[PDB]
Each structure stands twice: as C-alpha cells, then as structure tokens.
C-alpha cells in the first residue's frame, strides 16, 4: 500500500470549475436509472457517450475517478471498466478485436456499466490505409460495437484525450460519443476554487485574500500545476522549518505542528514552478510588473476599459454561468428569441492596434493585455511562432493558427512587433490572413490585437494593413508623463533613503543548528539633497520612452546599490548628479 | 553495474536535496507529508549535455535510500528497447513493468533516452509510437494509483518528449545537469582519484581543474583512465609485447603530471567536438598582447551584468540557505536588485585579424555561470533538416529558458552578409519582446564592421548604442612583453631544451606467472629590429612574425654559438 | 531465442601477425580487451575501466573487419575464448521498426551472457545515421 | 519466423563453422532473392563469395537462341538469330 498516493475516494466536490459537466454527467449515469419513464415519455435514448478533451492535468482522469468513486456506492450497482490507451491489444493480432468485443460483451453482462477509455487517441486513431490494417480494424470493431445492428446495452462509454482530432471522426457521433466535454485551463474563479480545495485540510489555513493573489499570480496553471504549487510550498516550508532531516539518513524526531506554510514559501514555489502550458514554449504572459506600473498603469487602464467595452467582458448577463442547472433552480422562467440576437449584436469587428514609440514598453502592454483576457484563446502570430517549424510552412502556420482561433472562441489573434511583422512576412501571407478574417460573421468574437513601434497611419489607411479594419481602433501609447516619471523614480529615491539595518540581507547563524534527536546611527541624507537628486533625475528624463527610463533607473539603481551599507549617503548623491549631468 | 552513492557525484548537490524529498523523506516521515495531505513528487526529467551524470544520479538514488529495512527496487529501460513488432506486446511489457514496479512498492524506474521511447505524438508517424506514448501517459497518471513508483527520465533535449509527459503527476520536475564549473571539475577529479594508491596533490588537481575547461564528467573519467593507462605503458611496457602473463608489481606505477599532459593531448571533450566556439582562457603566448584590452572587457561585463554583486541571488541550493542563514523576521528590494540589469548588449569591434577569436572565447570563459547559445553560421547550418530561421528561434528559446545566458554571434561582419535580413528581423523582434531585467546578454564580435550598420542599418533594432567596445592594436610595451618569450627561448642553453634522450640499457625483464655565447648588445639589436618591424600590427600580423622567428630559433636549438641565428633573424625582418 | 544471436565462429588463422601496417591500433587494442582480462589486478589498482567502445573508420578493404576478427582470435586461449558477434547495417531487418529494437536488445543480452564478447557492426552508419539528415 | 527453420539456420551455421580449413567440402547455394537469406550465413567464414547472374546482353542472347535452335530439322539463318537477339532486351534463357 501507498499511504501518500492518489486517493480513489474523491467526490465530485473536490473538482473545481467543472460544475456544468458534473450535472451533465449525472443525467447520463444516474437519471436514466432513477427515472426510466421520463425517457419513455419521449422516445429518447439517453446520451451514453462522452469524450473528455482538453489540456493535460485539467482533471479529465479526475472526473472519471470521481465518477468511479460515485458508482462504488450503495443503492445502484454500476460496474466500472477502466481501460488505458491500447491495453486491449492482445499479444497476437487475431485476438485484439476479440479482446475489445469481449470487453463490451462483459460490459453488456453487468448491465449498467461504464467503460472509461483513457488516452483513446492511442486506441482509436483516424483510419488510414497507409498506417496499418490492424489500427483500422480495431476502429471498425469499436464502431460496430458502440452501435451496430444490435443494442450494446446500458453501457456508457467515456473517452479522454488531449488530441481529439486524432480520434476517428465516425466514433464522435451521437450513439457512441454524443457529447464532447471541453476541459479548459481554469479561469481565476476556478483557480481560486482549486487552490481552496488543495489547502483545506491544512493545519493553519491560507487567508482568502492570499488565495486571491495566488489565483492572480498563477495563470496558465492547470489543476495539476496548482496542486504542484501547493506541494512545493509545503515542501519549502518543511525544509526551512526542519532542515536537519535532509542531512541525516536515520529518522529524527519531528513534529508537523511547528510547520506552517507561510506566504514567502508560496512565493518561492512560484519562482520555480513552470506550468505545463509553458514547458514546451517559453513561458506565460505576465501582468505588468511592479516597477513599471507607474509608467504604464494609466495607459493600460484606458486600454482595458476600451477592450472590455469593445468585447463586452464586464457585463456577461447571459454567459459565465457556473451551472445551468443552478440557473434553472435559482432563476425564474419567462414563460421572440431575438433578444439573444441583440445581445450577440454588440460585437462588430474587434480590432485593436496599439502604436507607439520605439521603446515605450509594448512588450509589457501586450503581456498585460493577454493576462486581462482570461477566457480568451490566444493565438500568437509572431515571427518566432511561424518560423519555428522547419516542417510546416508559414502560410500553413498562419492558417492553422487562425483556424484554431476560429474553432474555439473567444479568441485573440495576437501579433506583436507588427512593424517588424509587416517587413518580414511576405505580402501574400498578409493577404491570406485577411481573407480568413472576412470569412467570419461580425458577431464572431475573434479579436485581432496588434502592437507596433512607430508604425504610421499611411500603412493602416492605404497599405497592406488596410484590409484589417483598423480605422477607429488605433490606440496610441504616449511616452510617460512627468507625474508617472516622478512616481517611477520615487521608488528609487526610497532605496536611497533606506536604513542599512533594514535591507533584507539575511545573516548567517552564528550558533549551530538546534539539533534534533534521533528516534528509536542614522543616514546623513539631507532632504534638500533628496529634492536635488529628484529634480535632476526628472529633468534629465524629459520626453523619455519607457526603455530609456529603465536605462536611467538601472544606472542609478546600480549607483545606489553600491553604497547599500554606508550610513553616509552623501557621496552617493553627488555620484548620481555626476552621472546624470 | 557498480555500487554508487551520492558521494561519487560532484557538484550537483542542489538536485540531491530535491531528490531526497521525493524518494527518501516520504518513506521516513510519511506523517509530515500527509499533514499537508500532499502527494510527494515522483517524476523527474534529467536533461542536459551528455556525460554530466544523469545515469549516475539515477543509480545513486537507488543505491542510497536502499538499506537494511527498505529496499528500493531499481528498474532500468534503454531508449525504446521495449518495442516488439506487434505494438500490443510492447503495451503488455510496459504494463508488466509498471505492475512489477508496483509489486515492489518502494521502487524507481529509469527511462534512459526517453525521447527515443516517447516522442511528441503525431499522425505523420507510425501508430506504434503514439500507442506507446498513450499507454505510458495512462500508466504514469491514470485513474488508479501507480504505487510508490518514482519515474526518472534522461534525455539530451527535453523538448522532443511529448508535452503531456511534462506535467505534474508524471515527470513533475525537470533538472538541468550542466557542464561542471571549476569547483565541480575539481571535485570530480578528487572523486576519480581518491582510490588511487599514490594520490595527487591539491595544486596539480586544481591545475587540472583549470586545464579541463569544457570537460564533462565522462570526459574527466576517461581522462583519468587514459592517464593511468599511459602510466602503465610507461612503467611496464613489456606486457604489451608478450603472448602470456608476466610479473608486475603494483607498487611501482604512479601517475605523473606528464601522463596527464599526454592524456590532455588526446582526450577531446564534447564541447570541443560540437560546432560552436569553445570558451577557452586566453592562450599564454598572446596573453601579453590582449590581456590589457581583455581586462577592460571584464570590467565592462562586471558593470553591465552585475557579476561582482551576488548579494541576493546566492541561491546555490534552496536548502543550503536554510542551513547556515536565518529567515528574515518587503521583498521589493529583490526588484531593485533585478532592476540593475537593463539590456545587456556588447559589440566588440576591431581591425581585421586583431585576435577576436581569442577575445570572444576568453569572455565566454569569464562568464562561467552563463548558458552560451551560439549563433555563428556553422551552428545554424549544421543540422541539415533544420532551417536557418527555425535554428535561430530555437537558439533564442534555449537562451530564454535558461537564464543567465549569452546569445553569442562571432564574425558579425560575415554574419550580416550571409544571414538573410528577415532572420535578423526575427532575432531583433525576439530581443525586442524581452523584459528589461532579463539576463540574456547579446554578445557579438565583429571584424572591421562599420558604425553605419549599427546606427541606421540592419543592427539598429539591437541597440548597440553605447555598448560598442573597440579592440585596438596592441601597444609597443605589449609587443615587447610578447617577444620576450621568443628571446627567452633564444637565450636557452641546449642543455635546458628537452631532448627525448635515448636509453643507455635495455629494460629489465619481467618473469612469467659550456658557454652559450650571446652578447646582450646583440640581443638588444634583435629586440630593436623586432619592435621596428612590427609597427601598427594586429595580433595575427604579430603571430606571423613570432612564428617565423620561432621557426628560425628552433632550427638551431642545439647550437651553442647563437650568432648566425641572430643574423638570420635580422635577415628575415628586412 | 529466435533472432540473429549466433556467435561468428572465428578462425585461429587470423591474428595480429597477419595484419600489415596498423601497429598503433593493435597496441591500443591490447589494453582495451586483452590486458584487462590478463591483468585485472592492475586495472583495479587505479579503479579504471578500459574503453568498451571503438569506431574503426576508413576506406573499404583496409582491414577493419580483419582487425576485429584478429582481436577475437588474439585473447581466445587458455580455455578463455572471445565470443564474436558480428552484425551489419545493411540487413533487411535492420531498419525494421519494432523488430530491430528486439534484435538489438537480444544481441546485447547474449553478448552480456557470453561475458568476454566483441560486437562488430560492419556498417554502423546504416544502423545509426545522423538524426538531422534529409 | 517458425522455430524449425530458425533451428535449421542454427545448425547450418554451426556446421559451416565446423568445416575445417583444408577445404574439401564446398557448399554452393542458389537464390533469386539474396537479401532474404538469413544475414548470419553471409558473414565471414560462411557464404561469402558471390556470383551474380544477370539477365543476358545481346551477344549472350544470340548464343542462347543458337543453343535452343541447334537440334531442329529445318535450320535458322544467323541473321534472323541476330535480329531476334536485338529484339529481346530483357529476356533470360528461360
């Protein structure tokens, strides 16, 4: 026995963010058993087939595990058959389909059954004459078993993939796999709820405001990555609580009651966790960092207001329902469905081109906007995404990325460095992408978000970028105003006037570790000097962009970080004035 | 397989502590783990260059926690040796592998070269590969518990593994095993030599640690093996020329420094057999010519890259700061520490042939901590199935993933001539999408590059504005210090020059089972004409003169009258 | 047991006394196979392991196969033979995916089983080509 | 592969390695598909000298046609046999 392993008795309330799918599942496995006459009142057959699909660690196997735990209860015997990816292939080739039929025969025997096919794309790929005839004959056997001439019984077949297009398209048909449940990377409410689920039997709990900040800092985290975040925070808390048990092979005496997971343990875990949606590519887009928030927060707020006006993010009086069953419970019925048409008519052509100077923090603005759009499906049309395939063309990559935006809406087509992207993408590829955009309906919620440095209006009005309707959507990034520069540099003058006793230079233990038993002055800084260094620091950076201000700030932060121990900051101030002037 | 433990591994002590909390701490203290109700991580991907101790760490993990009470059962697979013709038998063999790993619950599975077992799944590839990746994904994290089975995978490139295999639950953590620094190469040489009869001193083993730059651990193991074999060939050569066993005594063979020099001659490391530049130190002959200029560069790199601070980011291991230091009773100070890096760029320009190939390598030797990514032409056009734009993007990606890193472009004047302009724009857009605090140094070395491609030309988007360093031609004093070794070789008496002298006897059987005349006014004359010849020379123009005069001097290496040698040297420089 | 697992039965009429012009590689090959079998007390004193791998490379008909066969018939004496396996990169089943891994694992199992062994791959670039090829 | 053929190869290889150096037994073997014999017997000390038997060229087909024609009661002139030689590029003796 593994006492620290995955627990099989997971209920449906240890799953966060998937509450529509739990209700939709419980009318396939439970409600035809309890109420057979309601389905008999119509002539309907219940949907007995569902394909779970989405990114890895989204809980697809967790929903099947919670379901198998639910069917392992009293008052309803439901046999569960768990199959891994192509374990049904026998040692020989004549018996593989004979195995698969045997599964269904046995599944028909216990008469309420569930077959879970985990990793079903490895069992039933798209039938190909150039592949292998056994991998098409197994698919044909499965197709004629889920619905041949005779009834397969009361057998619910569940599949699970992260590549559903690698399943044969005949299999995804009402009568085999009627429903397809998409398991998304969780949004902020669901990342909050998973972070509450993980830290709920903890001794000293996390506060709710801290779980809010953790849900904001984690993005692109699945449920697997959130559980890994909590595990690494708990392990870092153990190894700063009792570091002795790492240097001793024999067991020491340790109580896990002095171990409390603090906030900085979670911050150290967030420094080291790469989420699975960022391991293959580089990283995730991040919010606007805390140092440059004075320079760009006032422009980013105008952008965010324009973006949720244009995309109707803030209202959602129709969408974002946590479960439609609770909407039938908690909301009365009306007892003429063009009010839906007027509601979907509020999206005409989401375009946004953010133009600005050559160094004005466009990478920060683009990443912060891609964090603000949480439900959206970002497709990255940058040069580094198109040319990073020797195999695929950059005509097919543009088209496959647009069709990936179009298939799963809401979506963003994100083109950073558009002034570069014009010059190094060939002219007809820009014409090809424009064609895909006009093929869509005005109410399609596919945003085209572009960022550019010193891109004129002569390219937008009458040029290659004229077929994208960028006429009113032309947000200009200004350079930072003097109040923004003053608040930027006040955080640096605050570093000039810190006490050397208060910088977190953490000190060595002068004494040895409390060994476990085995078990069997003031700153000479005139405020006039502060005002003088602030005045020259401001009037040096007169009409600077964001990266020029970051250059000045990096140089002055170096000069201030040299004399970080000195109680006389008077050489530092004249050194800064010697530098800038 | 040999017995190993964690003390036969040098310089990977951060990862040994992370492995302890995943294989051995959950066995000892299960109540500490189920206090937070957290499952211990049981999947790690060891990745990096070859010969860096991935298999050694995987074996030491098994033989460390194994003891009297609990046995850790080790399972090793080679890279897709599980495959039969019918994929169903390979399914059954992976399934039986995980079932018998679960039967011995305390266990470890090692998948060596798991990119060969589990590539990225595709339909444009055989169904055996997608089938085995599907059953591997469902055996590592499926609907039932796999038991206390730790899955370890080794690979040289982690991005060729399927990405559903790189997520928490299966292969949760990824450890990059780097090529060792001076301290770890020192420790590896101590590990290899500690069972020797007569040991090496510390000064020579640190000389070896500095002489073996670019060596991985397999390189250092083969170096110590070849040095011991050369000492065997030197001591008792007779065993290489007899049919049967002779009698030798182990008391006589001791590995000397000259054996290590001969082994350093013939052992080639896996850095020196790659295609990019090799970060060697400045060679001892041209060090007087470029040491002064190179030193200025080390100050510039200390300034822009904050190499001399190391006051917040001293995290060798996360545990080791908990061992000696004390937890602080704002952490915006770390943002003002990260804020000292702004955009580390540096273009080293100079005249044609002015030792740029030495300076770039010496700078990459100075940045020991950094991940050097090479963008020279032979590194992009090396792989034949990989295009140039894709190669450049991949090079930037691996620099971005592992910071601090260098994006190194030698021969920049050739590079902007052959690389098409829409790859320079892709690289400029890649650098333009970086946060300012990101420590990715763009280090280009050029040869008679103008300033005009920097201000309003192709490299304007890269911002080499105030970061242009000029390698100038070496001074007259540098030239004097350079040619002093040449005249010191001229002043060497033929007694001092090492003749490979013959033997006076044969070797014993092993049974069965005057005045070197050189006046210092003549030396002053050859010095004065060597200086007068080399007026405004570059480094390579000086090395031509030094090579021709060293050829003339090595002609008469046994003469005791150095008159005609002097006359030939003054006849050449004319 | 059903694979290409047979030892190539060498003849004792091939030794280094029938090879011409390659004496450095013979002297380097004595310390690789012959001397660790003959003097295991000396390799253990430095705790060194000899190199278990060598690539013979050159134009055809220069004696790479002859050098391997003479290496097999060199220290095959004193009732202590060298079991010689010879494979080739030009086999029809060598590029047979699924089967070729089974044959290689069975070859290395049977070479570990007959303990002083030599595996000779006649055209190794047929078996292990560059993965970055076209 | 079957067991019984695999054991036939496993004994034919051991018999060929058992044959002495003073060569007095020679084993000739014929195939029309040479890379379908087992690879082991093509290794040194085994079936190692090969004779390729190509399709005939024009003079060879002339000689073959003469050989087939030889014993007819009414004869065939040599010019017609040469024309029939030039018309049959690709024709074995069968």
């Amino acid at each position: 026995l593994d006492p620290l392993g995955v627990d099989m008795n997971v209920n449906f309330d240890d799953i966060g963010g998937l509450d529509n799918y739990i209700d939709q599942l419980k009318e396939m496995v439970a409600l035809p058993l309890l109420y057979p006459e309601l389905y008999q009142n119509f002539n309907i057959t219940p949907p007995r087939g569902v394909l779970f699909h989405g990114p890895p660690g989204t809980g697809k196997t967790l929903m099947a595990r919670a379901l198998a735990a639910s069917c392992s209860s009293d008052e309803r015997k439901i046999t569960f058959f768990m199959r891994k990816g192509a374990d049904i292939l026998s040692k020989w080739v004549g018996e593989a389909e004979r195995q698969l039929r045997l599964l269904f025969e046995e599944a028909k025997k216990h008469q309420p059954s569930i077959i879970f096919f985990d990793e079903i794309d490895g069992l039933a790929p798209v039938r190909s004459s150039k592949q292998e005839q056994i991998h098409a004959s197994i698919v044909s056997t499965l197709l004629a078993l889920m619905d041949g001439m005779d009834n397969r019984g009361q057998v619910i077949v569940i599949g699970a993939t992260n590549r559903p297009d690698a399943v044969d398209p005949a299999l995804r048909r009402p009568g085999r796999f009627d429903r397809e449940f998409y398991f998304p990377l969780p949004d902020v409410k669901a990342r909050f709820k998973i972070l509450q689920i993980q830290t709920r039997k903890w001794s000293s709990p996390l506060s709710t405001n801290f779980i809010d900040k953790l849900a904001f800092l984690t993005k692109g985290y699945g449920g697997a990555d959130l559980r890994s975040l909590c595990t690494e925070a708990a392990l870092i808390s153990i190894q700063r609580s009792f570091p002795q048990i790492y240097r001793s092979n024999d067991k020491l005496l340790v109580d896990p009651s002095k171990i409390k997971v603090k906030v900085s343990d979670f911050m150290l875990a967030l420094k080291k966790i790469v989420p699975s949606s960022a391991r293959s590519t580089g990283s995730s887009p991040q919010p606007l960092p805390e140092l440059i928030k004075p320079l760009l927060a006032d422009q980013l707020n105008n952008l965010k207001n324009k973006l949720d006006y244009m995309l109707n993010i803030k209202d959602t009086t129709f969408q974002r329902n946590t479960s439609l069953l609770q909407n039938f419970i908690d909301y009365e019925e009306y007892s003429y469905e063009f009010f839906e048409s007027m509601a979907e008519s509020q999206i005409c052509k989401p375009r946004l081109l953010i133009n600005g100077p050559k160094g004005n923090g466009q990478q920060y603005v683009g990443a912060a906007i891609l964090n603000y759009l949480e439900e959206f499906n970002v497709q990255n049309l940058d040069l580094a995404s198109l040319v990073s395939e020797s195999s695929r063309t950059i005509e097919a990559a543009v088209v496959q990325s647009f069709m990936e935006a179009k298939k799963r809406q809401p979506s963003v087509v994100f083109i950073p460095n558009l002034d570069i992207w014009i010059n190094t993408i060939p002219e007809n590829v820009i014409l090809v992408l424009s064609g895909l955009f006009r093929s869509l309906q005005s109410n399609e919620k596919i945003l085209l978000l572009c960022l550019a440095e010193n891109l004129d209006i002569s390219e937008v009005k009458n040029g290659i970028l004229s077929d994208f309707a960028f006429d009113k959507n032309i947000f200009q990034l200004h350079k930072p105003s003097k109040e923004n520069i003053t608040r930027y540099f006040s955080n640096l003058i605050e570093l000039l006037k810190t006490k050397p006793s208060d910088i977190p230079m953490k000190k060595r233990r002068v004494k040895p570790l409390p060994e476990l038993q085995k078990v069997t002055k003031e700153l000479i800084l005139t405020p006039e000097q502060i005002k003088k260094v602030s005045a020259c620091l401001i009037e040096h950076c007169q009409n600077f962009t964001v990266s020029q201000l970051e250059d000045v700030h990096s140089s002055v932060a170096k000069i201030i970080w040299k004399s970080k121990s000195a109680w006389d900051k008077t050489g530092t101030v004249d050194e800064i004035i010697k530098f800038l002037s | 397989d040999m017995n190993v433990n964690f003390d036969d591994i040098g310089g990977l002590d951060n990862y040994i502590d992370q492995l302890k909390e995943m294989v051995a701490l959950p066995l000892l203290y299960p109540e500490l783990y189920q206090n937070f109700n957290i499952t211990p991580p049981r999947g790690v991907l060891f990745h990096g260059p070859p010969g860096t101790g991935k298999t050694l760490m995987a074996r030491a993990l098994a033989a460390s926690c194994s003891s009297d009470e609990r046995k850790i059962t080790f399972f090793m697979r080679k890279g897709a040796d599980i495959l039969s013709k019918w994929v169903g038998e390979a399914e059954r063999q992976l399934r039986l592998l995980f079932e018998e790993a679960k039967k011995h619950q305390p266990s470890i599975i090692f998948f060596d070269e798991i990119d060969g077992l589990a590539p990225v799944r595709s339909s444009k590839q055989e169904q055996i590969h997608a089938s085995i990746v599907s059953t591997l994904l469902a055996l590592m994290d499926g609907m039932d518990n796999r038991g206390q089975v730790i899955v370890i995978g080794a690979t040289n490139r982690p991005d060729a593994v399927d990405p559903a295999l790189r997520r928490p639950g299966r292969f949760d953590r990824e450890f990059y095993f780097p090529l060792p620094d001076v301290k770890a190469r020192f420790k590896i040489l101590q590990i290899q030599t500690r069972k020797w009869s007569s040991p090496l001193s510390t000064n020579f083993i640190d000389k070896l640690a500095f002489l073996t730059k670019g060596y991985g651990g397999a390189d250092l193991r083969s170096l110590c093996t070849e040095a011991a074999l050369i000492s065997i060939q030197r001591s008792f050569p007779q065993i290489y020329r007899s049919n049967d066993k002779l009698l030798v005594d182990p008391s006589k063979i001791k590995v000397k420094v000259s054996d290590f020099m001969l082994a350093l001659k013939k052992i080639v490391p896996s850095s020196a057999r790659s295609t990019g530049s090799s970060p060697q130190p400045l060679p001892e002959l041209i060090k007087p010519l470029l040491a002064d200029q190179l030193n200025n560069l080390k100050n510039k790199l200390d300034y822009m890259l904050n190499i001399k601070d190391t006051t917040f980011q001293r995290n060798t291991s996360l545990l080791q700061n908990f061992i000696d230091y004390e937890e602080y009773s704002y952490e915006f100070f770390e943002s003002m520490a990260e804020s000292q890096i702004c955009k580390p760029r540096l273009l080293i320009n100079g005249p044609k042939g002015n030792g740029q190939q030495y300076v770039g390598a010496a700078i990459l030797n100075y940045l020991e901590e950094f991940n050097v990514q090479n963008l020279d032409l032979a590194s992009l056009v090396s792989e034949s199935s990989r295009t140039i734009e894709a190669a450049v993007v991949q090079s930037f990606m691996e620099a971005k993933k592992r910071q601090p890193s260098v994006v190194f472009i030698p021969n920049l004047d050739i590079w902007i001539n052959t690389i098409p302009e829409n790859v320079i724009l892709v690289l400029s857009g890649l650098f333009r999408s970086l946060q300012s605090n990101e420590k990715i140094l763009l280090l280009c070395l050029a040869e008679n590059l103008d300033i005009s491609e920097v201000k309003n030309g192709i490299l304007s988007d890269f911002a080499f504005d105030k970061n242009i360093f000029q390698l100038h031609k070496p001074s007259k004093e540098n030239i004097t210090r350079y040619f002093s070794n040449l005249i010191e070789l001229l002043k060497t008496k033929p007694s001092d020059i090492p003749m490979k002298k013959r033997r006076v006897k044969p070797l014993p059987e092993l049974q069965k089972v005057k005045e070197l005349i050189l006046t210092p006014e003549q030396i002053k004359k050859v010095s004065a004409c060597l200086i007068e010849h080399c007026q405004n020379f570059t480094v390579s123009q000086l090395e031509d003169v030094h090579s021709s005069v060293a050829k003339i001097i090595w002609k008469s290496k046994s003469a005791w009258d150095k008159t005609g040698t002097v006359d030939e040297i003054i006849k050449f420089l004319s | 047991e059903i694979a290409d697992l047979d030892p190539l039965g060498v003849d004792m009429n091939v030794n280094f006394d029938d090879i011409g012009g390659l004496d450095n590689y013979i002297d380097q090959l004595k310390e690789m196979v012959a001397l660790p079998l003959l003097y295991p007390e000396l390799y253990q004193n430095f705790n060194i392991t000899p190199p278990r791998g060598v690539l013979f490379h050159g134009p055809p008909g220069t004696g790479k196969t002859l050098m391997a066969r003479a290496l097999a018939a060199s220290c095959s004496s004193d009732e202590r033979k060298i079991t010689f396996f010879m494979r080739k990169g030009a086999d029809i089943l060598s590029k047979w995916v699924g089967e070729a891994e089974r044959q290689l694992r069975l070859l290395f199992e049977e070479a570990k089983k007959h303990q002083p062994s030599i595996i000779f791959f006649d055209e190794i670039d047929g078996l292990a080509p560059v993965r970055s090829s076209k | 592969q079957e067991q019984i053929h695999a054991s036939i190869v496993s004994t034919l290889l051991a018999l060929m390695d058992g044959m002495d150096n003073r060569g007095q037994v020679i084993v000739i073997g014929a195939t029309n598909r040479p890379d379908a014999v087992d690879p082991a017997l093509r290794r040194p000390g085994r079936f190692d000298r090969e004779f390729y038997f190509p399709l005939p060229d024009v003079k060879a087909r002339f000689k073959i046609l003469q050989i087939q024609t030889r014993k007819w009661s009414s004869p065939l002139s040599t010019n017609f046999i040469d024309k029939l030689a030039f018309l049959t590029k690709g024709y074995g003796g069968a």
Partner: peptide, 15 residues
C-alpha cells in the same frame, strides 16, 4: 512497418 504474428504452429505430431 510493424505488425505481429500468429501463435506458432501446434505441431500435432501424434499421427
């Protein structure tokens, strides 16, 4: 190309 085979001939061998 990788596909598997029949469980081998029974070799009845009694008559």
């Amino acid at each position: 190309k990788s596909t598997g085979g029949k469980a081998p001939r029974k070799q009845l061998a009694s008559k």
